[PDB]
Amino acid sequence: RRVKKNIESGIVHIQSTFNNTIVMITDVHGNALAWSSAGALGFKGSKKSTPFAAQMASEAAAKAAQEQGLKTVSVTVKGPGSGRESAIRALAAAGLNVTSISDVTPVPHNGARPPKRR
RNA sequence: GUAGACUUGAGUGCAGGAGAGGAGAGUGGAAUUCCAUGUGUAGCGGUGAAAUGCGUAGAUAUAUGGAGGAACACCGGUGGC
């Protein structure tokens, strides 16, 4: 007896960090009910950005998107990593309708100093 | 040294351009972090890994606007000043 929706063109916010990756599926502006990460699953160690583990991370919330009931995907990828690519082909092949893989990695212009030497 | 001469060195004229040359007076965007904020769940961190820790007071992440400082990637180069 809880409030539910049937959206179709969700917006798939997936952030591949350089250690992990969230895999999220979003509303029209939006907000995510069907969403996860790699690190949601207990792959904590050297297994934090294995790309087939990222494939299943880009599969689990992907199949959880049909709780809402969406099939076409409005993909948005941010950030690179060491597990990004099989996640990319994963949600390109995750029972979905890949048409628009967005690339929204934000760019400074000699901005703030990063933390130092190593 | 003394008187003398000329430009043929220097500089001053008339024409050109050039630059991150200085010093002030302002403006713009990206980006970071933070104020609320959609609405959802443990996450994120880091490495060879984690304890560090923060965080369920339920958030990061994602939707927005605001705030502020910093600095201004290709331009940019054995380039110039």
> H or E segment at A6?
none
C-alpha distances (whole Å) from A24 to each of A65, A76, A118 are 9, 9, 31
Six-digit token string for A29: 């502006």
Sign of CA dihedral A43, A106, A24, A92: negative
Which residue, counting CA atoms, is nearest to the C1' of nucleotide B62?
A: A31
The C1' atom of B71 and the CA atom of A76 lie apart, in whole Å, by: 29
Residues 6+ apart with CB under 8 A from A41: A53, A56, A57, A60
What distance in Å separates the CA atoms of residue A27 and residue A9, rounded to the nearest whole number? 8
Residues 6+ apart with CB under 8 A from A72: A8, A9, A10, A96, A97, A99
Residues 6+ apart with CB under 8 A from A53: A38, A41, A43, A47, A83
DSSP A9-44: SEEEEEEE-SS-EEEE-B-SS---SSEEETTTTT--
* Omega before residue A30 within 30° of 0, cis: yes
Identify protein residues whose C-beta is within 7 angstroms of any atom in strand B.
Answer: A 3, 11, 13, 15, 17, 19-20, 22, 24, 26-27, 29-33, 35-40, 42, 44-46, 48, 76, 78, 106-113
